[PDB]
Structure 1
Amino acid sequence: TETKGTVLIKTAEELMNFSKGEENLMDAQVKAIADTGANVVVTGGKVADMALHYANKYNIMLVRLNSKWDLRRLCKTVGATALPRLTPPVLEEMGHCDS
C-alpha cells in the first residue's frame, strides 16, 4: 500500500500462516504470466527474492531497467504496453521479438 503499511497480528494462527501466505500469493502471480506463454519479464523497479525464486522455477527471464526513458523505448521495440499494475493475465498487450 501507499499510506503507511502495517501488519497486525492478533493470534498465533495469523503469525505462522503469514509467511506461507505471502509465498503462495507471489507464486500465483508469477505462474499467471507463465500460463500466458511469456518468456521475458522486464520490470522498472526492484525485484524481491521471492520473485526471483519463481522466475527461475517457471523458467522466465528477468530484465532490470532502472531508467524510465529506456523502458519507453522497449515498448516501441517489441510492440508492448508498460503496465503500471502488478502481473495480470495479459490479453493482447504483450511484446513479440525474435531472439
Structure 2
Amino acid sequence: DAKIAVYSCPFDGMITETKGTVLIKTAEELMNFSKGEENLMDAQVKAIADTGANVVVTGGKVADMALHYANKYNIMLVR
C-alpha cells in the first residue's frame, strides 16, 4: 500500500523568493534560530509522515536535514 508524496516544491525550508536574511540583535537568536531551523523542519516532515506518506517525489532541491529527517522517518525520495 504505497503512500506517494508529490511536490513540484523542492524539499527545503520554503525559501521566500524575496531576501529575508536573518538579522540578530542579541546572542541567543544564534542558538535559537538554527535549532528551530532544525526544529520546524522536523515538524514539517513529521506532519508529512503523520499522514503515512512513505515516498516523496520532486525534481526540485532537497534540504539535507529534510531528507535526513525523512530517513529518520523511513521515507522514500525522488529527485
1:41 CA drift (Å): 0.4
Matching of residue 56 in structure 1 with residue 71 in structure 2: yes
Q: Over alpha carbons, which structure has the higher Rg?
A: 1
Aligned equivalent of 1:13: 28
Give the CA deviation at 1:5: 2.5
Structure 1 unaligned blocks of 5 or more? 65-99
The 4+ residue runs of structure 1 with deviation greater than 6 A are: none
TM-score using structure 1 length: 0.61
Q: Identity rate of aligned residues, in percent? A: 100
| Aligned residue pair count | 64
Q: Mind listing any 5+ residue stretches in structure 2 that lack a counterpart?
A: 1-15
Alpha-carbon distance in 2 for matches of 1:18, 1:4: 17
- Distance in 2 of aligned mates of 1:19 and 1:47: 18
Structure with the largest fraction of strand: 2
In 2: Cα distance, 1:29 partner to 1:49 partner: 14
Q: Supply the RMSD in Å over aligned alpha carbons.
A: 0.9
Query: 2-side partners of 1:60 and 1:35: how far apart?
Result: 12
